[PDB]
């Protein structure tokens, strides 16, 4: 598998591992998003000290407003972070 | 780094490696997309035998229609593929 193939597969596995803690593995609930954010994204999470931030991220990512994140909504989180990071890498090297 | 962190970083590296063949490393041109598709995504590409398919994918992904893919447009390709793959994994296991 290529690196792109491997990363597509990891995305799927990470979602599934975090979405399968309760009885619905197709949705990440608020509790599961809390755990994902404090363990896969600990570094970004620990910085922020206001606990209302995750509640605000959740609402913002929950596009159909059912209170849970489905795979696609979770991908918009991954993508939003990779875009900010890529913007900083450009900013830092074409300065 | 977590698997999510590593995958965000690989996304950025893959884009940058494929976008940096010509003099613009912030955009993947048509030629570079051709190479990326025949090497990172060879398995999906080789199946299709109609060469007009990539031209049609390119047009579809090129949302601001400047003829090149920027990082975000490239992420919509990665995401569209991970979503179809996750849909097939659900279809196959909740059958």
């Amino acid at each position: 598998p290529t690196e792109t193939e491997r990363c597509i597969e990891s995305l799927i596995a990470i979602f599934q591992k975090h979405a399968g803690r309760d009885g619905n593995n197709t949705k990440i609930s608020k509790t599961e998003f809390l755990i994902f954010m404090n363990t896969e994204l600990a570094a970004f999470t620990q910085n922020q000290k206001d606990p209302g931030v995750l509640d605000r991220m959740m609402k913002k990512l929950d596009l159909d407003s059912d209170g849970q994140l489905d795979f696609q909504e979770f991908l918009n989180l991954i993508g939003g972070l990779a875009i900010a990071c890529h913007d900083s890498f450009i900013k830092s090297t074409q300065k | 780094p977590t698997e999510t962190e590593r995958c965000i970083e690989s996304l950025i590296a893959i884009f940058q490696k494929h976008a940096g063949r010509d003099g613009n490393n912030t955009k993947i041109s048509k030629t570079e997309f051709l190479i990326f598709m025949n090497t990172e995504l060879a398995a999906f590409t080789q199946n299709q035998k109609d060469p007009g398919v990539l031209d049609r994918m390119m047009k579809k992904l090129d949302l601001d229609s400047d003829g090149q893919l920027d990082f975000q447009e490239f992420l919509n390709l990665i995401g569209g593929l991970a979503i179809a793959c996750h849909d097939s994994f659900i279809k196959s296991t909740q059958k």
Partner: peptide
């Protein structure tokens, strides 16, 4: 890697 540090700085 670079991402983890970025995440720390951004937000």
């Amino acid at each position: 890697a670079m991402v983890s540090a970025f995440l720390k700085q951004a937000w």
